[PDB]
């Protein structure tokens, strides 16, 4: 008795226990709180109000089987890559404010339109996150980054050697200006010598650095590797 | 984790280690854990200190024996019990989820209730270091579909959650990405610079009920009615 | 392109039955694409391969070949083109690392420690969880150390160059290497990583990589050895890693417990960089520079 | 960064009389609890009433206010100067006997403005928000076999409880029930 | 780092007839509105350079404070407060310069925040001019001068297991080792 | 030769997105990237296809 | 109650817990110290200035 | 006479008795220094006699 009865005439400094739901009433310890609702408990035994939530993205439509995770593609850039329903969705969020940046319509069929899941990413040197749903076949999602700098003032910059971006455009391809994103850049490719021009980027100096970022989709397809012998 | 391949299905826990070689075809070797599964790919989490997952009862970390360095589960979520159990009908397995808040120590749970099958209502925040528990809870519920930790290009390392606020026809109408821990203590926090226009807000915490004169009582939260803008009340009835 | 046989620079070949095509060991330089080959003209072809068909065909069966590229860029104003002739701004060969450092678009390590003899090169800007370890000491040039860096089937002895891809969170990187206890400790900037070789040194065969916490490291400045345990800054304090005696394996403990409140200024980006580690040994004491919101120089 | 009075919603949307390029914030309130152990001194029978409840608040996350630098759009500069950034203020509800009709005091840390006879010059309201740690003494007179703590809020206030202590005193076990 | 001495930036000379450099004056400057009565000191509320720490107990006036050049007076004039600010209680208006300076012996000695040594003699600090000061030693002698910085240690808080009972102190017993 | 690399693909793109193509990647959208030997495993043709990912020891 | 009153009318020389800026006042160790600066604290529990 | 100021600093282990009279629910010490001066602090003990229960506030 004596125990307990000097505890509870005590000052009750320790209670970083958290909540506990399961134990009676009687038998709650010292250090735990039967109800705990929005409180955060500090390891020292403070008991403080949590935080709020900032909404930074909102839109309205019908959404089910969602997921959202985050990701740097192989300069440093960092977006949020997310399917909704059907669709694979980028964003990028900067002072709390997330932009749309992509929209991958009808990645998926109605069978994964509700269907969550199982998200990867790996680090290469054209990184990729790989969307495994138990329906569909496996889904990767690829960045493929080039980097140049600009020798003349004007709207335009030119990329020597891009073969990778023949199908460059604004659904494909995002134009960062020293870290800064270009609104509508217009892209012209040429196949005779490899080289995409890229205009309407605005005022550019000499030596300002021009990162293009181009995200694709792919399926993954059943395929048999031999050697010729 | 820890040298080892841990293969969570849903009634047990294997473990695959190489040994002092890779793991190939000729070098496997399947350890039998425990008999407590996990519930789905997205409720496997690795902390500072151990990998933790969510099985029907609760909540699970693994750890090494001290006899002769086997694996063994350890119940985190003792105390809260309770909490637990909705996940033994398929329906509600795909809807809980598991994050990792590294800025804070903690693990985020969002969990689910009987009545909404669309994404998890309540969440649950673990601190790692003395294997606490908490409960964050918003009106109408904090409907999540995933929890994830990115990098805003100003701020930098946060936890986004993506969620709805509204419902149409017991499907979600809406899609909105929010942001934790912000710099006030409201919830669905949003700035707008004024123009002369209206400001949208959220859903109204409420329940509607038909009266029928021989019922008296009618019930206040989710528990009792089932509907998505219920809210949870002060336990004080002199408030 | 610069080419060193047996310790003395050779001159290139452009022309056909010049002068120096006469000149044994001898070279000539060539550029091959899927669409053929073409070889070399003028000092100004864009070349990416070397032979020695010279009017003496070939090489001695041990001649050392040596060929590099002098191109200084991505490096300061005051440095040379030329080979090392104890000088300053010379070029010192690096067998193999511009297959995993980008000396066209300037990636280039970031990361140094040294592991059982071997230098160890951790951090890519474009291959972010990649590190690549040199040949045991002096093993392919005697007299030189720590020079090779190559992977192919040309030497497949263990003694040779090896690397270790890491698979982990995203927007991770390797930050900081040490060696401790038997084990290489890669730290990343969300994870820490250990690599053990058992009972053997650690080579392409014998590299196995434990997963120890998902604490990782500010930058390499944050990591030291004490008389008693190895310490680490991360993004929430202080943590030093201990063995397990369930098992053996490593995880880590929180030492600045108590300070918790003081930490957390270093997961924006551009403080990354600014807190730094020392330790003195003299006083038996760990110097932590920390820094704080609104100074971002030091 | 001036809150104002909520008006009334109209079909979800809700509009405000605010000068053009005014910083609007707006988000729904959550309810915050802690709620403490049950004391029965180790009986089941005896009464113990209660005298007073120590809480021990640490407000430095609090004591910090609004400078003139702050000023958006010409607003009122002496409506947001010396203005508390993070309000502090909580309630404090105390149940006996299992009973969950307890007594209540709701504004611990005093008024969020000036009253006559109460506020104090050159320090803004409440004044026990601007000291770093505050202890406060609430008294709480009541008689029961069990008795228990909830500190709670449903505002945009924060409250960040360090410590608590009850005083009480044992009597006899003459409990009989609620009705 | 551990110098022979207990003064920041120690810097040895011989006596020339040259002067001394001093590094920066600890000290933070601030455009006064009229509208503002609160302004930080402490680095985390001010974000400058050459901010320094204050001694947490107000009732020591560690502050040389200046409006327009105008010595303002640590109780009449100004209030150091608990949380990093100091209180303007008189009038001033909008664009004076607001100075405070680190003086830990007061108004009395604004150059205290320096030590000199002239021969392994402590000198009173001379005024500095344009962060350099002359003494007038003779040629030869050895000028050792630093920054002085604040050490302090502090007890844990002493309750005796009570948040409202009264403990009168009596007496401190210090053991020091002086060898 | 002996040394040439044969990859035959299947490019039936059922069980996928309406906006996928039935052709190899080439810097597109909805094309297809080999998996050497994963039908041997998943159904290509009842729709049963893996789902969950992982990584361990440099191999998916 | 007996623990700490008789704690904190005894003589405190094991001061060797350095510097504890995460508990409560009411909860700082008495080998800790809330505030420390520019104070060395040796492993015998003496403080000293730097 | 003979020793130098201050006399105190002369004895190699000194203990002070510093009187502090003031009444409060919690007490604390700062033993600070703003000078060139040293101190080592070897221990401490405090002499507080305890009363029933009127705090009120500083306001």
Not at chain 2, 75 to 97: A, C, H, M, N, Q
């Amino acid at each position: 008795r004596n125990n307990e009865v000097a505890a509870e005439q005590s000052i009750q400094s320790n209670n970083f226990g958290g909540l506990n739901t399961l134990a009676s009433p009687l038998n709650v310890p010292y250090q735990d709180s039967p109800l705990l609702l929005n409180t955060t408990v500090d390891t020292s035994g403070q008991v403080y109000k949590r935080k709020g939530t900032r909404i930074t993205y909102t839109t309205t439509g019908t959404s089910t089987g969602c997921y959202i995770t985050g990701f740097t593609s192989g300069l440093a850039y960092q977006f949020q890559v997310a399917k909704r329903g059907r669709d694979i969705l980028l964003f990028q969020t900067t002072n709390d404010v997330t932009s749309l940046l992509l929209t991958k319509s009808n990645v998926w069929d109605t069978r994964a339109e509700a269907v969550r899941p199982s998200v990867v990413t790996t680090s290469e040197v054209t990184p990729r996150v790989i969307f495994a749903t138990g329906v569909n076949k496996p889904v990767q999602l690829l960045f493929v980054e080039q980097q140049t700098t600009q020798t003349a003032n004007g709207t335009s910059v030119v990329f020597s050697s891009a073969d990778r971006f023949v199908n460059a455009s604004t659904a494909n391809c995002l134009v960062y200006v020293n870290r800064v994103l270009v609104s509508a850049p217009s892209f012209s490719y040429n196949a005779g010598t490899k080289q995409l021009t890229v205009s309407n980027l605005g005022s550019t100096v000499i030596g300002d650095v021009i990162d293009l970022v181009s995200v694709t989709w792919q399926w993954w397809a059943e395929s048999q590797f031999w050697y010729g012998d | 984790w820890q040298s080892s391949l841990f293969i969570l299905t849903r009634q047990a826990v294997f473990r695959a280690n190489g040994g002092s070689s890779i793991l190939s075809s000729t070098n496997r070797v399947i350890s039998y854990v425990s008999s407590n599964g996990c519930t789905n790919s997205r409720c496997i989490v690795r902390t500072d200190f151990n990998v933790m997952y969510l099985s029907d009862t609760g909540v699970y970390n693994i750890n090494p024996l001290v006899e002769n360095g086997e694996y063994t589960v350890k119940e985190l979520s003792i105390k809260i019990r309770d909490k637990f159990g909705v996940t033994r009908e398929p329906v509600y397995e795909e809807l809980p989820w598991m994050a990792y808040d590294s800025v804070n120590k903690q693990v985020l749970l969002g969990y689910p209730d009987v009545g909404q099958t669309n994404t998890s209502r309540y969440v649950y925040v673990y601190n790692t270091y003395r294997e606490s528990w908490t409960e964050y809870n918003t009106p109408c519920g904090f409907n999540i579909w995933s929890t994830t930790e990115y990098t805003d290009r100003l701020l930098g390392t946060s936890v986004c959650s993506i969620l709805y606020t509204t419902t149409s026809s017991g499907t979600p109408s809406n899609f909105i990405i929010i942001r934790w821990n912000a710099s006030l203590y409201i919830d669905f926090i949003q700035r707008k610079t004024h123009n002369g226009s209206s400001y949208e807000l959220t859903t109204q915490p409420a329940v509607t009920h038909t009266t029928n004169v021989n019922q008296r009582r009618y019930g206040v939260n989710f528990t009792l009615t089932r509907q998505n803008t219920a809210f949870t009340i002060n336990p004080v009835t002199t408030v | 392109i610069d080419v060193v046989v047996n310790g003395v620079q050779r001159t290139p070949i452009y022309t056909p039955g010049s002068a120096p095509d006469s000149v044994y060991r001898n070279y000539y330089t060539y550029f091959a694409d899927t669409t053929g080959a073409a070889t070399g003209t003028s000092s100004t072809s864009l070349v990416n391969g070397i032979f020695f068909d010279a009017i003496p065909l070939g090489l001695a069966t041990n001649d050392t070949v040596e060929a590099s590229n002098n191109t200084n860029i991505h490096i300061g104003s005051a440095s040379i083109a030329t080979r090392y002739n104890y000088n300053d701004g010379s070029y010192i060969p690096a067998f193999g690392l511009g297959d995993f450092a980008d000396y066209l678009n300037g990636y280039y390590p970031s990361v140094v420690t040294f592991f059982q003899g071997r230098l160890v090169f951790g951090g890519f800007p474009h291959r972010p969880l990649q590190v690549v370890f040199s040949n045991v000491n002096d093993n392919i040039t005697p007299g030189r150390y720590y020079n090779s860096f190559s992977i192919t089937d040309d030497n497949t002895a263990l003694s040779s160059a090896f690397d270790i891809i890491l698979n982990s969170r995203p927007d991770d990187r390797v930050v900081a290497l040490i060696e401790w206890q038997s084990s290489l400790f890669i730290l990343t900037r969300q994870a820490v990583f250990r690599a053990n070789g058992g009972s053997s040194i650690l080579s392409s065969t014998n590299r196995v990589i434990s997963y120890v916490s998902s604490n990782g490291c500010t930058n390499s400045r944050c990591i030291v050895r004490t008389d008693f345990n190895v310490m680490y800054l991360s993004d929430t304090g202080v943590y030093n890693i201990n063995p397990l005696v369930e098992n053996g394996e490593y995880t880590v403990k929180e030492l600045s417990i108590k300070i918790r409140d003081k930490f957390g200024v270093t997961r924006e980006p551009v403080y990354e960089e600014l807190p730094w580690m020392a330790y003195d040994s003299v006083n038996k004491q760990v110097l932590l520079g920390y820094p704080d919101v609104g100074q971002t120089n030091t | 960064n001036i809150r104002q009075v909520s008006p009334t919603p109209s079909a979800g949307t809700f509009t405000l009389g605010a000068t053009n390029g005014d910083i609007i914030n707006w988000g729904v309130n959550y309810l915050t609890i802690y709620t403490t152990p049950q004391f029965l001194w180790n009986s089941l029978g005896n009464f113990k009433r209660t005298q007073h409840a120590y809480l021990f608040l640490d407000n430095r996350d609090g004591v910090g206010v609004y400078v003139a630098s702050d000023v958006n759009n010409g607003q009122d500069i002496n409506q947001l100067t010396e203005l508390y950034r993070v309000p502090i203020n909580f309630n404090l509800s105390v149940m006996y006997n299992n009973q969950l009709d307890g007594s209540t005091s709701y504004d611990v840390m005093g008024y969020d403005s000036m009253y006559w006879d109460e506020g104090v010059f050159d320090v803004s309201s409440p004044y026990d928000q601007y000291q770093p740690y505050q202890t406060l003494k609430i008294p709480i007179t009541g008689i029961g076999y069990a008795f228990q703590m909830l500190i709670w809020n449903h505002s945009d206030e924060y409250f960040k409880l360090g410590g608590y202590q009850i005083i009480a005193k044992q009597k006899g076990k003459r409990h009989i029930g609620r009705y | 780092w551990n110098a022979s001495l207990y003064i920041d930036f120690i810097q040895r000379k011989t006596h020339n007839g040259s002067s001394y450099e001093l590094t920066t004056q600890p000290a933070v400057t601030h455009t006064t509105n009229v509208n503002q009565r609160r302004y930080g000191v402490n680095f985390t509320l001010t974000r400058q350079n050459t901010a320094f720490t204050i001694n947490p107990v107000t009732t020591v006036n560690d502050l040389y404070v200046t409006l327009d050049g105008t010595l303002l007076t640590p109780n009449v004039d100004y209030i150091k407060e608990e949380t990093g600010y100091i209180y303007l209680l008189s009038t001033f208006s909008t664009g004076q310069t607001l100075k405070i300076a680190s003086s830990p012996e007061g108004n009395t000695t604004p150059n205290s925040w320096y030590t000199v040594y002239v021969n392994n003699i402590r000198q009173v600090s001379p005024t500095p001019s344009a962060g350099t000061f002359t003494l007038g030693a003779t040629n030869g002698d050895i000028i050792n001068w630093g920054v002085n910085y604040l050490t302090i240690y502090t007890t844990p808080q002493f309750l005796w297991n009570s948040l409202g009972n009264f403990k009168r102190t009596q007496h401190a017993y210090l053991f020091l080792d002086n060898r």
